Short mmCIF file of C-alpha atoms and ligand atoms in Angstrom, two decimals:
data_model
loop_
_atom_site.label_atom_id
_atom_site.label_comp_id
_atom_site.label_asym_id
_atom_site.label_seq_id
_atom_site.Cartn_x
_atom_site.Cartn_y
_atom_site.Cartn_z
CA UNK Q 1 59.36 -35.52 -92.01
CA UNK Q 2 55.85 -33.73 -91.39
CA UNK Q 3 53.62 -32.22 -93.26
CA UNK Q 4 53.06 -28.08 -92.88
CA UNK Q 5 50.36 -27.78 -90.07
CA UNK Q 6 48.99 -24.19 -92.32
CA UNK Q 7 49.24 -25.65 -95.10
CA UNK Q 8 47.36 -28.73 -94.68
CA UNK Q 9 43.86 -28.36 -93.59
CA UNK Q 10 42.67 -30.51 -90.10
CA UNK Q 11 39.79 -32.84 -89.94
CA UNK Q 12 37.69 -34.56 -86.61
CA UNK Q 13 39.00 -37.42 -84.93
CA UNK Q 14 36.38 -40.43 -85.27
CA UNK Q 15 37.32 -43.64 -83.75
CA UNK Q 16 39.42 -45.49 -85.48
CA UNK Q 17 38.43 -48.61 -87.87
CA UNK Q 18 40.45 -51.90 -87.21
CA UNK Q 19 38.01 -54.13 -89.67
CA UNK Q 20 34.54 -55.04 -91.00
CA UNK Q 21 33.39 -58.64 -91.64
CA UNK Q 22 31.77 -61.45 -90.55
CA UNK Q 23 31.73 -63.66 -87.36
CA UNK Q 24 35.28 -65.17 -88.53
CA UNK Q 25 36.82 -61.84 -87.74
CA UNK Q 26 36.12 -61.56 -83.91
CA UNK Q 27 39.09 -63.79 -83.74
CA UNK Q 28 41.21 -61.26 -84.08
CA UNK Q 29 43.57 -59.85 -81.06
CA UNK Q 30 42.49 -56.74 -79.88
CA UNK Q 31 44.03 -54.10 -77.71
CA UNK Q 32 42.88 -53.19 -73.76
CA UNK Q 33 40.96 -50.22 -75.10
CA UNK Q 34 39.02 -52.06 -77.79
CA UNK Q 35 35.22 -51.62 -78.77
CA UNK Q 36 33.14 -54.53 -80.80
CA UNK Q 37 30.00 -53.99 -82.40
CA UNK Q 38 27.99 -57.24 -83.70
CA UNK Q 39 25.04 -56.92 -86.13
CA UNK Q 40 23.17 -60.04 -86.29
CA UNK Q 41 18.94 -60.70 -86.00
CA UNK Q 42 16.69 -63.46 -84.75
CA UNK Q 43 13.72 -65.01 -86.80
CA UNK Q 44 10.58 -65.76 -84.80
CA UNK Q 45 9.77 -69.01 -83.45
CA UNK Q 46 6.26 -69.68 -83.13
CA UNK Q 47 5.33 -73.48 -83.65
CA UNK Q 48 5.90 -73.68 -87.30
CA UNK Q 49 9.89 -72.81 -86.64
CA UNK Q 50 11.23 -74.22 -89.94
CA UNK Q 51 11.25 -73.73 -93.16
CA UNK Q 52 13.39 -76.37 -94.55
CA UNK Q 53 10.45 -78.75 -93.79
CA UNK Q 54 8.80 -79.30 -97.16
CA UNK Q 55 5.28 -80.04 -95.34
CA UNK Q 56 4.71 -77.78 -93.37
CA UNK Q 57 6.92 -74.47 -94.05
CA UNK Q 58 3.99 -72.96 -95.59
CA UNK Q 59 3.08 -71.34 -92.38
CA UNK Q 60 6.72 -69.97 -91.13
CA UNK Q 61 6.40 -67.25 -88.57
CA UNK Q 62 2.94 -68.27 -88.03
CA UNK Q 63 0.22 -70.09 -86.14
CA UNK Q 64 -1.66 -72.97 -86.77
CA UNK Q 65 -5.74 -71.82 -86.69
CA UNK Q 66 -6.85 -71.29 -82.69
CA UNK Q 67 -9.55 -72.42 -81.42
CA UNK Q 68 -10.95 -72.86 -77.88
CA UNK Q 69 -11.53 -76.63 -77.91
CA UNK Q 70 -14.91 -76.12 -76.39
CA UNK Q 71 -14.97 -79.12 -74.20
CA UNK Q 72 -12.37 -79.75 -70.71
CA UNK Q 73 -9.57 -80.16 -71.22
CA UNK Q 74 -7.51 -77.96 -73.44
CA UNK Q 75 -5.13 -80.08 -75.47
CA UNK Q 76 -3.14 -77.41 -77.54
CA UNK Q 77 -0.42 -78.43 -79.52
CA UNK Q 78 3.16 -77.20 -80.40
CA UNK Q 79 1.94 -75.49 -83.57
CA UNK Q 80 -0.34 -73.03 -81.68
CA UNK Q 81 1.97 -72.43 -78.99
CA UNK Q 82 4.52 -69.63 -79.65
CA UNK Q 83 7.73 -69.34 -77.65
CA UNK Q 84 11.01 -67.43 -77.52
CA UNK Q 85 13.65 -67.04 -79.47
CA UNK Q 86 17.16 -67.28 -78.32
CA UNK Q 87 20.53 -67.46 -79.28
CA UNK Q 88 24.21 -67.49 -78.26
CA UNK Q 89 27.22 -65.66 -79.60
CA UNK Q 90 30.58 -67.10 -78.78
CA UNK Q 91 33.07 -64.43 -78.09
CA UNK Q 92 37.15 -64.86 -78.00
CA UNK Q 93 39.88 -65.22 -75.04
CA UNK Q 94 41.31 -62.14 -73.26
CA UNK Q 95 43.70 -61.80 -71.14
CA UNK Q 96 44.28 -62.40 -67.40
CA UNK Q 97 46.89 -60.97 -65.08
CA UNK Q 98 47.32 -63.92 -61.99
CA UNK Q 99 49.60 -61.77 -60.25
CA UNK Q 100 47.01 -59.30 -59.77
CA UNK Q 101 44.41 -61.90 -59.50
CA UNK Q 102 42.43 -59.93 -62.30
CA UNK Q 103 40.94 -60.63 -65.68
CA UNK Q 104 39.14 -59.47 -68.06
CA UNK Q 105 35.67 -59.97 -69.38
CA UNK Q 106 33.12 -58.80 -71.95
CA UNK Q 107 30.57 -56.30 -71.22
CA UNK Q 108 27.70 -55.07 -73.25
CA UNK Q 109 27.60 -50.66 -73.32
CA UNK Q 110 24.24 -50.52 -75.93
CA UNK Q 111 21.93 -51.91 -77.99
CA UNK Q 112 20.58 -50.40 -81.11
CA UNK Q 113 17.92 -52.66 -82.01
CA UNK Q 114 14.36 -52.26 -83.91
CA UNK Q 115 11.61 -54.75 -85.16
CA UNK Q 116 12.39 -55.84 -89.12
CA UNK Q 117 9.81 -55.95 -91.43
CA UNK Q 118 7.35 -53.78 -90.33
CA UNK Q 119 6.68 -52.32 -93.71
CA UNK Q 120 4.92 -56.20 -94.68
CA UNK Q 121 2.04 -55.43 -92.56
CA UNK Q 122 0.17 -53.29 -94.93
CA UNK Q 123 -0.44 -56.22 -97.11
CA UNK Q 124 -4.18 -56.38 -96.86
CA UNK Q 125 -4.93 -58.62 -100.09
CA UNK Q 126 -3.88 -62.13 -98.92
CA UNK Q 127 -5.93 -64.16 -101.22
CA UNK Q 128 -7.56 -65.94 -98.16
CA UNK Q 129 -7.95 -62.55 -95.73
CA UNK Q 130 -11.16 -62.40 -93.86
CA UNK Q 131 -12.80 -59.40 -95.83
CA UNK Q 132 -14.27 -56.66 -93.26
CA UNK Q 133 -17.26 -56.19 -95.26
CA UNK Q 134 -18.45 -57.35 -98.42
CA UNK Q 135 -16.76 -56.30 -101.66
CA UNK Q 136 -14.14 -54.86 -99.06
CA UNK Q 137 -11.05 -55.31 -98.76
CA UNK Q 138 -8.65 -57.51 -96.26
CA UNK Q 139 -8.76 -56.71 -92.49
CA UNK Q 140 -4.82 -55.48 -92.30
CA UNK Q 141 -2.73 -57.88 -89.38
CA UNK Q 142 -3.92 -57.01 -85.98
CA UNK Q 143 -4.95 -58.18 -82.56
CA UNK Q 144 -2.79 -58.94 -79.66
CA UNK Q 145 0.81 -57.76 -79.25
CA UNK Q 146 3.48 -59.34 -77.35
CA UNK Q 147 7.35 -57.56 -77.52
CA UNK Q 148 10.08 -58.42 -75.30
CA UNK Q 149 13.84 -58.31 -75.67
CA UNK Q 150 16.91 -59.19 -73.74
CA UNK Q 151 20.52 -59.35 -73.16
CA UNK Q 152 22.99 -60.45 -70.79
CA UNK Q 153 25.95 -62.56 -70.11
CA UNK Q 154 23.66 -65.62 -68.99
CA UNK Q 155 20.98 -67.41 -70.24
CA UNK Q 156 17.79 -65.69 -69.14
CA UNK Q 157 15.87 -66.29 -65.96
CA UNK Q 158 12.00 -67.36 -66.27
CA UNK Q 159 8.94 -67.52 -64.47
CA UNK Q 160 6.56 -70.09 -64.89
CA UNK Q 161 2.85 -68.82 -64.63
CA UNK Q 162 -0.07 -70.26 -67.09
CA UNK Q 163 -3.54 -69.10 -67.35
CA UNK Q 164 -5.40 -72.36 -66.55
CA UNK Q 165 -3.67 -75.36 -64.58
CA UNK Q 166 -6.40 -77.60 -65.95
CA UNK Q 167 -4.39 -77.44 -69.50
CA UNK Q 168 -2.78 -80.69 -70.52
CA UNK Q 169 0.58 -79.06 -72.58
CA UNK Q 170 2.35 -82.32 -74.80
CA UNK Q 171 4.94 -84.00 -73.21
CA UNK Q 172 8.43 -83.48 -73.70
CA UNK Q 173 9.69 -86.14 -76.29
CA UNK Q 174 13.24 -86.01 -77.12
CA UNK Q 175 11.86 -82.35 -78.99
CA UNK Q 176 8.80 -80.38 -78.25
CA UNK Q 177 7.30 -77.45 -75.87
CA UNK Q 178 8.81 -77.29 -72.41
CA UNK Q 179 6.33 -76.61 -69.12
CA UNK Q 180 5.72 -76.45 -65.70
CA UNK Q 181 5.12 -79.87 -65.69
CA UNK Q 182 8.08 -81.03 -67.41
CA UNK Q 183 10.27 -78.60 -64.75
CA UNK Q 184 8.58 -79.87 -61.30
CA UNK Q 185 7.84 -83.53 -62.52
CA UNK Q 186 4.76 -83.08 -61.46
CA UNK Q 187 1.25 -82.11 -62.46
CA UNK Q 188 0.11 -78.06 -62.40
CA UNK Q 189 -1.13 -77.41 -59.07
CA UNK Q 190 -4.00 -74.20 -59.56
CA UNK Q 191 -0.88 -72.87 -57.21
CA UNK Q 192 0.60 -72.28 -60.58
CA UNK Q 193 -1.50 -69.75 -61.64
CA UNK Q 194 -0.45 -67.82 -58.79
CA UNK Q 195 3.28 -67.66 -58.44
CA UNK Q 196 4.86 -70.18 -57.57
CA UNK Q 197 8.49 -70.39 -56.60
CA UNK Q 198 9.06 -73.71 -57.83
CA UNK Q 199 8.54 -73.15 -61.22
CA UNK Q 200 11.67 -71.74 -62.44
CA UNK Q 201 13.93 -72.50 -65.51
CA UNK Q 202 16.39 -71.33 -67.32
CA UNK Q 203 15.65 -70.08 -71.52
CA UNK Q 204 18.12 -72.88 -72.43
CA UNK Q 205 16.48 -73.74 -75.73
CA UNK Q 206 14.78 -71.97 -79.10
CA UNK Q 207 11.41 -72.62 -80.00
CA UNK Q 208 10.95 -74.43 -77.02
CA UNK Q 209 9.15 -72.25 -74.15
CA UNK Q 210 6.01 -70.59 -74.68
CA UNK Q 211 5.10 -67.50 -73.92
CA UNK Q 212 1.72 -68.82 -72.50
CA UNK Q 213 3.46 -69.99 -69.49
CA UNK Q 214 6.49 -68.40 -69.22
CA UNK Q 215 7.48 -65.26 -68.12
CA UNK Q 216 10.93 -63.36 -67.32
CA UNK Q 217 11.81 -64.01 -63.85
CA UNK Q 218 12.26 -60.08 -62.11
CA UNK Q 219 14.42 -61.32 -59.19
CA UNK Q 220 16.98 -63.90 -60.61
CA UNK Q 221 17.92 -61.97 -63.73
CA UNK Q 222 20.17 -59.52 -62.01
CA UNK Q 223 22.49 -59.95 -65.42
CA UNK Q 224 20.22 -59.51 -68.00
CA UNK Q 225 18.40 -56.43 -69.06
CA UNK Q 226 15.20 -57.05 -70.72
CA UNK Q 227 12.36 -54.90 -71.65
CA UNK Q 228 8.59 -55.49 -72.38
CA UNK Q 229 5.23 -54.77 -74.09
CA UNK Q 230 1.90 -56.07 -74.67
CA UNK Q 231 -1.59 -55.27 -75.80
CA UNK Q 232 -4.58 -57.76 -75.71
CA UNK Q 233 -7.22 -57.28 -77.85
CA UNK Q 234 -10.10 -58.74 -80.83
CA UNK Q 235 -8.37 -56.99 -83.57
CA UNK Q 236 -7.08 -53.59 -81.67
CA UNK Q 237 -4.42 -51.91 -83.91
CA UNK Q 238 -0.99 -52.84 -84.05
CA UNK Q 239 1.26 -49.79 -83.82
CA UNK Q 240 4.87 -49.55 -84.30
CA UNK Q 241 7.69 -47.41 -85.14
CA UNK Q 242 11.43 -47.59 -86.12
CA UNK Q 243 14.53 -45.83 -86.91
CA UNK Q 244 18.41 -46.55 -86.61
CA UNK Q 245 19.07 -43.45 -84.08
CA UNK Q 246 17.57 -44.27 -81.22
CA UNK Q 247 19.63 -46.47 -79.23
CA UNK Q 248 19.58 -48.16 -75.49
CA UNK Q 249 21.88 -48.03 -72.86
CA UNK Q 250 22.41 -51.42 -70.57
CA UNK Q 251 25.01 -50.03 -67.95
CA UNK Q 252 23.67 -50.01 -64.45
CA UNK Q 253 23.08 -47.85 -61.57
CA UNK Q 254 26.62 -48.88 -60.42
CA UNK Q 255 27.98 -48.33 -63.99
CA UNK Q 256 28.31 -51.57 -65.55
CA UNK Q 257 26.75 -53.69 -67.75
CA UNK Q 258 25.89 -57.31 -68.50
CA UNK Q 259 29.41 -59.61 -67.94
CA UNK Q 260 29.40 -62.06 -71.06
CA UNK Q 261 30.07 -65.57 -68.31
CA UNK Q 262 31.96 -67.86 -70.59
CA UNK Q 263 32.50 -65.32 -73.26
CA UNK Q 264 29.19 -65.80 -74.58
CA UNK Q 265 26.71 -63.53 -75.13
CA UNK Q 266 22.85 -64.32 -74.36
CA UNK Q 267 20.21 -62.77 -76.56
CA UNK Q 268 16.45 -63.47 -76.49
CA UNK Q 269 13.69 -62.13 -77.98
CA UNK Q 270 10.04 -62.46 -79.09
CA UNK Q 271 7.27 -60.37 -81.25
CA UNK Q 272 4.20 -61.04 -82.01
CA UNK Q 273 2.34 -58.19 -84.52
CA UNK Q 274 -1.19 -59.68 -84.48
CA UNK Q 275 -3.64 -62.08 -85.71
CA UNK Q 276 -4.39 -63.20 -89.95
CA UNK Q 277 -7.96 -63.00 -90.54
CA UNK Q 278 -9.52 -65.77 -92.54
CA UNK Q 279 -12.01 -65.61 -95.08
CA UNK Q 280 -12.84 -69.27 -92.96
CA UNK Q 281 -13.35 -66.86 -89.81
CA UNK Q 282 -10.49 -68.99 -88.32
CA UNK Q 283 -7.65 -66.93 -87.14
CA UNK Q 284 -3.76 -67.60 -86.27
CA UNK Q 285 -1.03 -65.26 -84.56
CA UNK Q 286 2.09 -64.04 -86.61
CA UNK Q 287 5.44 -62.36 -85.88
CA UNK Q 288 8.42 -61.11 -87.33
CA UNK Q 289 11.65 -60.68 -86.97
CA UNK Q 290 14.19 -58.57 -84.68
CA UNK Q 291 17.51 -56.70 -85.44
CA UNK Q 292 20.64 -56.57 -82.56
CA UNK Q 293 23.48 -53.87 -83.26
CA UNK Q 294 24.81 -54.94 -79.60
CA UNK Q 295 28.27 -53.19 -78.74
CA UNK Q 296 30.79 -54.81 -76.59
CA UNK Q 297 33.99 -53.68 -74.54
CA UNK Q 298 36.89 -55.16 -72.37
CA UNK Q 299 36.26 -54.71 -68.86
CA UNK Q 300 38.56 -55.70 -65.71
CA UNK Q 301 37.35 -57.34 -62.73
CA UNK Q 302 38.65 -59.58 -59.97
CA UNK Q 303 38.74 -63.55 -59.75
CA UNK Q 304 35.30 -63.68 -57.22
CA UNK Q 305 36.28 -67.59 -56.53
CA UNK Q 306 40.06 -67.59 -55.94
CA UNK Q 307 41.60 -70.75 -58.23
CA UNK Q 308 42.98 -72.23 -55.29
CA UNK Q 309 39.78 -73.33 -53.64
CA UNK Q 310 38.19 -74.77 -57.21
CA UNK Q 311 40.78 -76.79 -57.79
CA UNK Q 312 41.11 -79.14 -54.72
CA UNK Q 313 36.57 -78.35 -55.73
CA UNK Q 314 37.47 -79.57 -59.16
CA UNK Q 315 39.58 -82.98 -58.17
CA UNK Q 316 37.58 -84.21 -55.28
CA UNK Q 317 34.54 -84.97 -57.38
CA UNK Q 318 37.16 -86.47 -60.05
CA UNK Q 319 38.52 -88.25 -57.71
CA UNK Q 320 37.52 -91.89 -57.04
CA UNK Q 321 34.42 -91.28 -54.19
CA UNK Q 322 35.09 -92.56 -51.03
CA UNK Q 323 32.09 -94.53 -49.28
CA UNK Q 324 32.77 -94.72 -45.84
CA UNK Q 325 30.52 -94.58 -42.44
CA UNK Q 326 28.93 -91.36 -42.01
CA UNK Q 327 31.00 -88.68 -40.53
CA UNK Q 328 29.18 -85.50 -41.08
CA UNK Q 329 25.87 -84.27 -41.17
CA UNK Q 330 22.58 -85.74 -39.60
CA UNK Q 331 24.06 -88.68 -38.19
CA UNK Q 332 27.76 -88.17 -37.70
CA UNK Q 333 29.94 -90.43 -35.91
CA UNK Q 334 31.91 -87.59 -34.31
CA UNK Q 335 31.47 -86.51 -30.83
CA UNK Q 336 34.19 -84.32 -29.72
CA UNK Q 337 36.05 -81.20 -31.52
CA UNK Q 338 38.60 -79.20 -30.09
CA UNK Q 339 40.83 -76.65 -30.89
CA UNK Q 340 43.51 -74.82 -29.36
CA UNK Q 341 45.35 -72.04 -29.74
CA UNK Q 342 48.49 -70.11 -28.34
CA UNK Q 343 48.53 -70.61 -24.04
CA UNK Q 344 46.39 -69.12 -21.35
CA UNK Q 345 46.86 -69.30 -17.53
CA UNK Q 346 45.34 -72.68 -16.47
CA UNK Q 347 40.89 -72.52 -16.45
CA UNK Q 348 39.46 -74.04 -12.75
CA UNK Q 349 37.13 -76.61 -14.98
CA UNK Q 350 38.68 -78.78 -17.34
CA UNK Q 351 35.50 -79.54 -18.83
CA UNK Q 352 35.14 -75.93 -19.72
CA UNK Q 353 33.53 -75.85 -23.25
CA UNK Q 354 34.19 -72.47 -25.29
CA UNK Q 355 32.75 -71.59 -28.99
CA UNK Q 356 32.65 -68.56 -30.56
CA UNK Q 357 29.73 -65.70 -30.68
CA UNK Q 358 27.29 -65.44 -33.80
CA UNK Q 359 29.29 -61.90 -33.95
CA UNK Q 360 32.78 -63.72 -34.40
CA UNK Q 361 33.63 -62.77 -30.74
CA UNK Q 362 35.34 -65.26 -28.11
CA UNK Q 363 32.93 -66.68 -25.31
CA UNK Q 364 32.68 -68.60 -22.75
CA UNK Q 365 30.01 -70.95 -21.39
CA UNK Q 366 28.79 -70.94 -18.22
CA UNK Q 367 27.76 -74.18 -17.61
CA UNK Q 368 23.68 -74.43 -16.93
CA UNK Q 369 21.65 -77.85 -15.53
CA UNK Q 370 20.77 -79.61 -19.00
CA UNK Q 371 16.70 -79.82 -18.03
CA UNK Y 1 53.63 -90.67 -72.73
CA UNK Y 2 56.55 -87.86 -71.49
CA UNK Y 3 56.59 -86.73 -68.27
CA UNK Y 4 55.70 -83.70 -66.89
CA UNK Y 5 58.00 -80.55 -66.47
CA UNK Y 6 58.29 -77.32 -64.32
CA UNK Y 7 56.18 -74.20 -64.70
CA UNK Y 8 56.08 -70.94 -63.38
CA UNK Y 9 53.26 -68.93 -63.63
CA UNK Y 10 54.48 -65.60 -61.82
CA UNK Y 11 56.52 -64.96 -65.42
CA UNK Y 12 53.70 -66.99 -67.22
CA UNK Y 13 55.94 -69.42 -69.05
CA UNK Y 14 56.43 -73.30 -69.14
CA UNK Y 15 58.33 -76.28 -69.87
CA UNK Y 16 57.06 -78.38 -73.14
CA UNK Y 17 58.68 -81.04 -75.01
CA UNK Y 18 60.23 -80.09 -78.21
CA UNK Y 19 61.20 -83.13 -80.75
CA UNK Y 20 64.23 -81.74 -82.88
CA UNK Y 21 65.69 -84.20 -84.69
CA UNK Y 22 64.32 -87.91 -85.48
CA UNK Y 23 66.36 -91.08 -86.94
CA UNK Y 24 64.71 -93.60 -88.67
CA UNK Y 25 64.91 -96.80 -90.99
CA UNK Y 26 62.79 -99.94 -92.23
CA UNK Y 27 63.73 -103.03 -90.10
CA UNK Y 28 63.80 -106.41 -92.48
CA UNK Y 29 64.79 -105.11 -95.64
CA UNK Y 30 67.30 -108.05 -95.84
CA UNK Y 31 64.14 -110.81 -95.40
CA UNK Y 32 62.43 -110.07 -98.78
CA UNK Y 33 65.41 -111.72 -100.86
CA UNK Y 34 63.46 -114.83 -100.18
CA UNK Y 35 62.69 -115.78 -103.71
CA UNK Y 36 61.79 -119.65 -102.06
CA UNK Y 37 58.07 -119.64 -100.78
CA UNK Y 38 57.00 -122.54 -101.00
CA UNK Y 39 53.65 -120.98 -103.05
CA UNK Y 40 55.52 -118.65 -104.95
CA UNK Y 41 55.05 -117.87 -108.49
CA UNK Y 42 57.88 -119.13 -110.68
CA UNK Y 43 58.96 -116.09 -112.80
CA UNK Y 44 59.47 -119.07 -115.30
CA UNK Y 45 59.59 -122.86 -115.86
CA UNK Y 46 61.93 -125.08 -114.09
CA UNK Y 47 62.98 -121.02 -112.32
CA UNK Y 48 62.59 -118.96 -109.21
CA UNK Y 49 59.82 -117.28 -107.80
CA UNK Y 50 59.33 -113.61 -108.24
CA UNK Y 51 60.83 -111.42 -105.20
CA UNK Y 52 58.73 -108.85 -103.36
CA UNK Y 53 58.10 -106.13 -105.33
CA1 CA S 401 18.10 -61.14 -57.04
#
């Protein structure tokens, strides 16, 4: 049975529609050939990061008033120091073919993402706005401008640089801003603002880093794409546009995209739109949220570490540790190490000693007076 | 705690233990005809106490 091909008028061929939900559906088993889009969006975190609190959630997605302290040191606290936001999405199994010693992994194609709530910024009559001249009205959200997004199959690699060393950040108590001092141990060095090598870390936590003192890391994050934007300024205009056409590509030069390591997906993200003018004169930074339409497919690649090697890796430091007398490194207690292979016509010296070139190659020493 | 079986990962199977069938039945049934305890309740005067139930 078919239906008559001149009778029956033809149509395009979009790709096909398996299902449409929420994150309880990415459980279901998907062909080789497979394509997953995930729609999801990230509220700002910038020192007032809750609003469950029943204190203090008058101020979500906003600053508490800055001020230079006018007197060394600085002593800022958590509520005036705005940091990224991150967050993780889990993503299922796939398959693995051991006989081939291949699997297969997640990668990211595209993003199609845009800044929400732009359209709030035209609010210029908040009851406490700093007018800009008498019987005027409200001076609209302005001022600096900090945008940065990324994604990638690992948390994302940071930089650690801070305007002043002399700053005393708070400590880290079980909860609170992460920085260069809590990374080294030690106390900022003016090395530190400079680069410095040594401070490094990982965005492992929300809320937590601020953008003061951290910055993306350009040589470690080989697996994350991220892009960037600023503008500094009293109360310079804020500009921004939006639209759900334009979107982003994240393959490489090599054709490939971020690898989702442990099935999990890595997003971060920050965006600050300006300052809120007081009618006090005091003034406090505010942001916004951001929108991820990130789209996914199956990719093969080859086991890099072959399973063999991790698991006698794997064991070993299971194992019950064995504390014996030294036998390798600085001070062995090893003082000969042959080998041998296959049979050669007998050598002159028996206390020839051979090794083997820096190029692989077989040598021979020819013995020399030892000084 | 069973032991452990065969595998073979070239076809991608294994070996688990299956339970298929299960006997069972309540050991000292017999013991609660005991209507002497030395603190049981007589289930009248000058009577027996009052069996397990
Ligand atoms: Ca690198």
């Amino acid at each position: 049975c078919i239906p008559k091909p001149g009778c029956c008028p033809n149509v395009a061929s979009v790709p096909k529609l398996l299902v449409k939900g929420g994150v309880e559906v990415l459980s279901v088993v998907t062909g080789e050939d497979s394509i997953t889009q995930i729609e999801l969006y990230l509220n700002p975190r910038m020192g007032v990061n809750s609003p469950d609190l029943p204190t203090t959630s008058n101020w979500y997605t906003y600053t508490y008033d800055l001020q230079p302290k006018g007197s060394s040191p600085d002593q800022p606290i958590k509520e005036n120091l705005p940091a990224y936001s991150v967050a993780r999405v889990s993503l299922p199994m796939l398959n693995e073919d051991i006989t081939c010693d291949t699997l297969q992994m997640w990668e990211a194609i595209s993003v199609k993402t845009e800044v929400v709530g732009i359209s709030s910024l035209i609010n210029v009559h908040y009851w406490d706005m700093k007018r800009v001249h008498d019987y005027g009205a409200g001076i609209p959200v302005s001022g600096v401008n900090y945008h940065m997004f990324a994604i990638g199959g690992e948390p994302l690699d940071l930089q650690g640089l801070v305007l002043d060393y002399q700053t005393q950040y708070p400590k880290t108590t079980n909860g609170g801003p992460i920085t260069i001092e809590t990374v080294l141990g030690r106390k900022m060095t003016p090395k530190n603002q400079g680069l410095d090598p040594q401070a490094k870390a990982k965005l492992d936590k929300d809320g937590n880093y601020p953008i003061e003192v951290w910055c993306p890391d350009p040589s470690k994050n080989e697996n994350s794409r991220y892009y960037g934007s600023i503008q500094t300024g009293s109360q310079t205009p804020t500009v921004l546009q939006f639209s759900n056409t334009l979107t982003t590509v994240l393959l490489d030069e090599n054709g490939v995209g971020p690898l989702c390591k442990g099935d999990g997906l890595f997003i971060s993200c920050a965006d600050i739109v300006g300052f809120l003018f007081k009618t006090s004169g005091k003034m406090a930074l505010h942001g916004l949220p951001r929108y991820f339409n990130v789209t996914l497919r199956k990719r093969w690649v080859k086991n890099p570490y072959p399973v063999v090697n991790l698991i006698n890796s794997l064991f070993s430091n299971l194992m019950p540790k064995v504390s014996g007398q030294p036998m390798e490194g600085k001070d062995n207690q090893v003082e000969e190490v042959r080998i041998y292979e296959g049979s050669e016509q007998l050598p002159g010296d028996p206390d020839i000693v051979r090794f083997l070139d820096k190029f692989g190659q077989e040598k021979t020493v020819y013995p020399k007076p030892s000084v």
